[PDB]
Amino acid sequence: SSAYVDSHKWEAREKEHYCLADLASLMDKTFERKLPVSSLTISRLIDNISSREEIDHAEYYLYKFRHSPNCWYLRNWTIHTWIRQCLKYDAQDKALYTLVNKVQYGIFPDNFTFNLLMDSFIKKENYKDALSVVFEVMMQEAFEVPSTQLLSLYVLFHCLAKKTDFSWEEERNFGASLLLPGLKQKNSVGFSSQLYGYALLGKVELQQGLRAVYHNMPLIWKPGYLDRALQVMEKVAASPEDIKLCREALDVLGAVLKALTKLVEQLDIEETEQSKLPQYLERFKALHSKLQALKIESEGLLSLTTQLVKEKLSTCEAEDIATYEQNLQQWHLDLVQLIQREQQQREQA
Amino acid sequence: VRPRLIAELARRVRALREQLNRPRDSQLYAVDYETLTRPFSGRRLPVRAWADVRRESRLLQLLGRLPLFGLGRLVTRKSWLWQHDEPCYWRLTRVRPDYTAQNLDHGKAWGILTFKGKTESEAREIEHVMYHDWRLVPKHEEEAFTAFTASVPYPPLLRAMIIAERQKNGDTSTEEPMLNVQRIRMEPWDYPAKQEDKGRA
Amino acid sequence: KAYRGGHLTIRLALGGCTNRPFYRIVAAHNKCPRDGRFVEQLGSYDPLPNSHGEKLVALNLDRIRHWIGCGAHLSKPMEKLLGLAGFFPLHPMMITNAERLRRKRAREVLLASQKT
Amino acid sequence: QPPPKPVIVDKHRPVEPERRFLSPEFIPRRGRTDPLKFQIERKDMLERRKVLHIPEFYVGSILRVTTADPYASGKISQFLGICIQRSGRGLGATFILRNVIEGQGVEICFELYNPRVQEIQVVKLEKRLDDSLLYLRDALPEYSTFDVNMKPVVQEPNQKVPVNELKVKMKPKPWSKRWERPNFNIKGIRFDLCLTEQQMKEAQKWNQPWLEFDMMREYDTSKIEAAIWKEIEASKRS
Ligand SMILES: [Mg+2]
Ligand SMILES: [Zn+2]
C-alpha cells in the first residue's frame, strides 16, 4: 500500500524555514533559565530539521522538554513531525530507542502514524524491531484502531516464527499482547486468539506467580485464566463459525506440563491454583471432547487467514486516511491561532 | 513604645526562601528499597508498608507508561479494593508531574472519585499519592469492574432523666424515646481527605 | 497563655499526696498541663473505697451537657468511666478487657481441674 | 537506563575561524644581543612545552595552579588567582596571580617554566582594557575576592577573546603608585568618584603627548614574530 504509506502533503505543508542554530540557542537559553516554553518552538525546530545531527539535537531537546516545567501537552502533530523527520532520514535505531524508553522521551504515535511506521518496517523486512514495537504498543494500550489488523498480522506471524522454547518475559509479553487485537470481537480468529492469550497468561501465572502478571503490565488480577479459557470454549461450543488451529495442542501441552509434578496473595477460603490444576485438566479434557463432538479442521494456518483480512483491511484504510486528513485539517485550524498568540507577546511589547 | 523590624525582615526572608527552594516532591518522596529510609529525612518506613514499597511502584511511575498519564483511565485504590469487595476508583481530571523528576514518577493529580459506587459531583484532591499501593486497571474489563447496584434507645440514665422530666411536666408519653441513626452517616476510615488541609515540609 | 489552635477537652486532674490519688473531672484546653489551670470545675472521683467499701464519684450533668454542646473532646478514661456510669455508652475496650479476663479465668479453672 | 548525550551546533560561518595567537614572552626585548641566545632558549622552552601545556590566557583572566611543594599537606600547593601581569622574557618569564581570602590579599609570582609547578588551568579567560591590573591593590577587595572552588567556565574552542568592558571603584586617595597620572593610561578606574574635576585637571598636566607621536621609540615586531612562528612550527614538526 504505497499510497497508504506515503504522504508528501505533510512535508510540503506549513514549513517554518527558520535557523536550526538560532532555535537551538534560544531553547538552550530558555532551559538554562529553566522557564517554561511552548511547543511551537519545538515544532518549528522539528519541521525545520533536515540533518542527522539536527535530529540528534531534537532528541536531546525532547528529553529536556520531558524534563522541563511542562510535560503533559504531548501534541500528536509535533510527535508526527518528529516521527517523519526520523523515518525519512532513516534512523531506526533512534526511533526504536525512543519508543522503548518512551518514559525517557514520551513519544506516543496515533493509529495512522503508527501504521505508517509499521508499514515502513514491513518494507524494510525486519521482525525484531516490529516485535519490540508491538510489545511497546501493548504497553500503550491503544488498539481500537484500523491498525488492529496490522497488530494481529504481526503477532500471528511472529508467534509462529519465534522459535524460542523458554523465555518468561517474552512469553508473558506475547500472552498479554495476543488479547488486545482480538478484543474487536470479529470471528474465530479473534476469540481463539483471546483464548490462546488467556492460556499463555495462566501459564505465566502458574510458572512465576501472579505478581509479574500485573506489576509492570496492565492486567486483571483474577487468577482463573484457565477457568476463563474454559468458559470461552464452552460458550463458543454453545454458540457462527469456529475456524480452529493446532494451538489447542500447545494449550494441551501447557496443561499437561503443569499437571506434571513468601507473600501469599491467594485468599484462604478460595482454593489455590496448584490444587485447582486437577479439575482444570479434567474440565479441559471434557471441553476438548465436547468441541470435537460438535470447525475442528485445525489446519487453516492463522497467519495465512490474515491475508483474507487484507480486503477489509484495504477497506478500513480508507476511513483511516479520511480521519487522518480530518486530523490534519483541524491541526491547521487550531495551530494558526497559536502563531498569532506568539505575535500577541510582541504586540504587547 | 518601641517596635522591632529585623524580626519581620527575617520572617519575610525565610518565607520567600522556603517557598522558592523547598525540597522537591520527588526528591523527598524518593526511597531506597534496600534500606527503606527516605532521603532528606533519615526516617524509617512503617512495617505495614515495607513490603508494598519493596515490591510495588508509585502512581506517577504507573502513569508514565501511557500517553497523557491516562486521563480517564481506570486506577483504583489498592487499599480500598483489598478492604472492600465493592469497586472504587478515581476519575482523574487534572495532572501535573514534577519536571525535576528523572523518570517523571512524582507529581500531583486528581479529579472525581467514587466509594463503593457512591460518586459525588466534585473534582477534588486525591489523598496518599506517593504510596506504593497503586494498581492500574486496563480499558478492557471496565464496565464489568465498575458495575455496582432506624433508631437506637438512649442510654439508661439519660432516658430515665427524660422520663422524670416529662413526668414532672405532666405528659405521659409512654413511648420510649429514640433518636435518628439513618441520618448519621458514619463514614469508614478509608474515605479520603483534603490534601491541602495537611501541610508539607 | 493563648495556645494556638488546640481544642477544649474535659479530663482528669490529679490531687492528693503520693499513694493517695484523687481525680477531678474538669474542663480545660488540650494543651494545658495535667494539673494546669482550668475553666470550670465539674466533678470529683475517688479510686479508693470509703468506709462503706464503695467508691465516690460525682457528675455535673447540666454543665457537662453545656460544655459538650459548646464542643470539647474527651479522653479514653473519661468516656470509659462515663459509660460505666451509664449516662454514656459503654466502652468497647472495656468489653474486650472483660471478655479477656473471663477467658483467662476459664483457662485457669480448666488448668486447675486438669491438675487436680 | 543510560543518560542521553548533550550536543550543540551553531555554525555562523565568519565567526568560527580564529587564526593565530602567540605568547608575549617568546618575543625578545628591544635590547641588543645575538638571537642565537633567543633561539636556544626558545627551543628549550618548547621542549618543555611538549610536556606542559600552559593554557594560553591574558591579563584579567583567572588561573588555578597546582605545584609540587616540599613542605605542605600532600606536598602540593593549589592556588587560584586573577592574572595581574606577565613579566619577563625567556625561561625566567613569570605571571602574577592575586586573590583576597580571609579578608587578606595574597598574591604570587609564578614561573611558568619551572618544573616545580605541576599543572595550570584557565578557570576564566577574558581581557581588560588596562594592560596591567596592579591598581587592584588599591581597588576594593570585593573585586579581587574570588572563590577557590569555582569550576572552569568552559570556553568555546575557536572563538574571539571575550572582553569585559567595565569600570572599578577604588579605595580612597592614599595610594602607593599615583594611578591618576597619564603615565599609565588606564581606564578601569572611575575618576568621577575617585577624585575631583579640578584634581584630574591638575594631574593631567604631566601628560606627554609628544612621545606617543614619536616614532623611534616604538618597536616593530612583525618579521621577528613571523620567524618565531616558523621556528615553533619547525620544533613541532620535529
Ligand atoms: Mg609604596
Ligand atoms: Zn491529702
Coordinates of N, CA and C in Angstrom, one line a residue, chain C residues 36-113:
Chain C
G36 N -2.7 21.7 85.3 CA -2.7 23.1 84.9 C -4.0 23.8 85.2
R37 N -4.1 25.1 84.9 CA -5.3 25.8 85.2 C -6.5 25.3 84.3
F38 N -7.7 25.7 84.7 CA -8.9 25.2 84.0 C -9.9 26.3 83.8
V39 N -11.1 26.0 83.4 CA -12.1 27.0 83.2 C -13.2 26.8 84.3
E40 N -13.9 25.6 84.3 CA -14.9 25.3 85.3 C -14.7 23.9 85.9
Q41 N -14.6 23.8 87.2 CA -14.5 22.5 87.9 C -15.9 21.8 87.9
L42 N -15.9 20.5 87.4 CA -17.1 19.8 87.2 C -17.4 18.8 88.2
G43 N -16.5 17.8 88.5 CA -16.8 16.8 89.4 C -15.5 16.2 90.0
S44 N -15.7 15.1 90.8 CA -14.7 14.5 91.6 C -14.8 13.0 91.4
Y45 N -13.7 12.3 91.9 CA -13.6 10.9 91.8 C -12.6 10.4 92.7
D46 N -12.9 9.4 93.5 CA -12.0 8.7 94.4 C -11.8 7.3 94.0
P47 N -10.6 6.9 93.5 CA -10.4 5.5 93.1 C -10.2 4.6 94.3
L48 N -10.3 5.1 95.5 CA -10.2 4.3 96.7 C -11.6 4.1 97.4
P49 N -11.8 3.0 98.0 CA -13.1 2.8 98.7 C -13.2 3.6 100.0
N50 N -14.5 3.9 100.3 CA -14.7 4.6 101.6 C -14.8 3.6 102.7
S51 N -15.3 4.0 103.9 CA -15.5 3.1 105.0 C -16.6 2.1 104.6
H52 N -17.6 2.5 103.8 CA -18.6 1.6 103.4 C -18.1 0.6 102.3
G53 N -16.9 0.8 101.8 CA -16.3 0.0 100.7 C -16.6 0.5 99.3
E54 N -17.7 1.3 99.1 CA -18.0 1.9 97.8 C -17.0 3.0 97.6
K55 N -16.9 3.4 96.3 CA -16.0 4.5 95.8 C -16.9 5.6 95.4
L56 N -16.3 6.8 95.5 CA -17.0 8.1 95.4 C -16.8 8.7 94.0
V57 N -17.8 9.3 93.4 CA -17.7 10.0 92.2 C -18.9 10.9 92.0
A58 N -18.8 12.0 91.3 CA -19.8 13.0 91.2 C -19.8 13.5 89.7
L59 N -21.0 13.8 89.2 CA -21.1 14.4 87.8 C -22.0 15.6 87.9
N60 N -21.6 16.6 87.1 CA -22.4 17.8 86.9 C -23.0 17.8 85.5
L61 N -24.3 17.2 85.4 CA -24.8 16.8 84.2 C -25.1 18.0 83.3
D62 N -25.8 19.0 83.8 CA -26.2 20.2 83.0 C -25.0 20.9 82.5
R63 N -24.0 21.1 83.3 CA -22.8 21.8 82.9 C -22.0 21.0 81.9
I64 N -21.9 19.7 82.1 CA -21.2 18.8 81.1 C -21.9 18.9 79.8
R65 N -23.3 18.9 79.8 CA -24.0 19.0 78.5 C -23.7 20.3 77.8
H66 N -23.7 21.4 78.6 CA -23.4 22.7 78.1 C -22.0 22.7 77.4
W67 N -21.0 22.1 78.1 CA -19.7 22.1 77.5 C -19.6 21.2 76.3
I68 N -20.3 20.1 76.3 CA -20.3 19.2 75.1 C -20.9 20.0 73.9
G69 N -22.1 20.6 74.2 CA -22.7 21.4 73.1 C -21.8 22.5 72.6
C70 N -21.0 23.1 73.5 CA -20.0 24.1 73.0 C -18.9 23.5 72.2
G71 N -18.6 22.2 72.5 CA -17.6 21.5 71.8 C -16.4 21.2 72.5
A72 N -16.2 20.0 73.0 CA -15.0 19.6 73.7 C -14.8 18.1 73.6
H73 N -13.6 17.6 73.3 CA -13.4 16.2 73.2 C -13.1 15.6 74.6
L74 N -13.2 14.3 74.6 CA -13.0 13.5 75.9 C -11.9 12.5 75.7
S75 N -11.2 12.2 76.8 CA -10.1 11.2 76.8 C -10.7 9.8 77.0
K76 N -9.9 8.8 76.7 CA -10.4 7.4 76.7 C -10.9 7.1 78.1
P77 N -10.1 7.3 79.2 CA -10.7 7.1 80.6 C -11.9 7.8 80.9
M78 N -12.0 9.1 80.4 CA -13.2 9.9 80.6 C -14.4 9.1 80.0
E79 N -14.4 8.8 78.7 CA -15.5 8.1 78.1 C -15.7 6.7 78.8
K80 N -14.6 6.1 79.3 CA -14.7 4.8 79.9 C -15.6 4.9 81.2
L81 N -15.2 5.8 82.1 CA -16.0 5.8 83.4 C -17.3 6.5 83.2
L82 N -17.5 7.3 82.1 CA -18.8 7.8 81.8 C -19.7 6.6 81.4
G83 N -19.2 5.8 80.5 CA -20.0 4.6 80.1 C -20.3 3.7 81.2
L84 N -19.3 3.6 82.1 CA -19.5 2.8 83.4 C -20.7 3.4 84.2
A85 N -20.7 4.7 84.3 CA -21.8 5.4 85.0 C -23.1 5.0 84.3
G86 N -23.2 5.2 83.0 CA -24.4 4.9 82.3 C -25.0 6.0 81.5
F87 N -24.7 7.2 81.8 CA -25.1 8.4 81.0 C -24.5 8.3 79.6
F88 N -23.4 7.5 79.4 CA -22.7 7.4 78.2 C -22.6 5.9 77.7
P89 N -22.4 5.7 76.5 CA -22.3 4.3 76.0 C -21.1 3.6 76.6
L90 N -21.3 2.3 76.8 CA -20.2 1.5 77.4 C -19.0 1.4 76.4
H91 N -17.8 1.2 77.0 CA -16.6 1.3 76.1 C -16.3 -0.1 75.5
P92 N -15.9 0.0 74.2 CA -15.6 -1.3 73.5 C -14.3 -1.9 74.1
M93 N -13.3 -1.1 74.5 CA -12.1 -1.7 75.1 C -12.5 -2.3 76.5
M94 N -13.5 -1.7 77.2 CA -13.9 -2.3 78.4 C -14.5 -3.6 78.1
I95 N -15.3 -3.8 77.1 CA -15.9 -5.1 76.7 C -14.8 -6.1 76.5
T96 N -13.8 -5.7 75.7 CA -12.7 -6.6 75.3 C -11.9 -7.0 76.6
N97 N -11.7 -6.1 77.5 CA -10.9 -6.4 78.7 C -11.8 -7.4 79.5
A98 N -13.1 -7.1 79.7 CA -13.9 -8.1 80.4 C -13.9 -9.5 79.8
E99 N -14.0 -9.5 78.5 CA -14.0 -10.8 77.8 C -12.7 -11.5 78.0
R100 N -11.6 -10.8 77.9 CA -10.2 -11.4 78.1 C -10.1 -11.9 79.5
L101 N -10.5 -11.1 80.5 CA -10.4 -11.6 81.9 C -11.3 -12.9 82.0
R102 N -12.4 -12.9 81.4 CA -13.3 -14.1 81.6 C -12.6 -15.3 80.9
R103 N -12.0 -15.1 79.7 CA -11.3 -16.2 79.1 C -10.1 -16.7 79.9
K104 N -9.4 -15.7 80.5 CA -8.2 -16.1 81.3 C -8.7 -16.9 82.5
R105 N -9.8 -16.5 83.1 CA -10.3 -17.2 84.3 C -10.8 -18.6 84.0
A106 N -11.5 -18.7 82.8 CA -11.9 -20.0 82.4 C -10.7 -20.9 82.1
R107 N -9.6 -20.4 81.5 CA -8.4 -21.1 81.3 C -7.8 -21.6 82.6
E108 N -7.7 -20.7 83.6 CA -7.2 -21.0 84.9 C -8.0 -22.1 85.5
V109 N -9.3 -22.0 85.5 CA -10.1 -23.1 86.1 C -9.9 -24.4 85.4
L110 N -9.8 -24.4 84.1 CA -9.6 -25.6 83.3 C -8.2 -26.2 83.7
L111 N -7.2 -25.4 83.9 CA -5.9 -25.9 84.3 C -5.9 -26.5 85.7
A112 N -6.6 -25.8 86.6 CA -6.7 -26.4 87.9 C -7.5 -27.7 87.9
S113 N -8.5 -27.8 87.1 CA -9.3 -29.0 87.0 C -8.5 -30.2 86.5

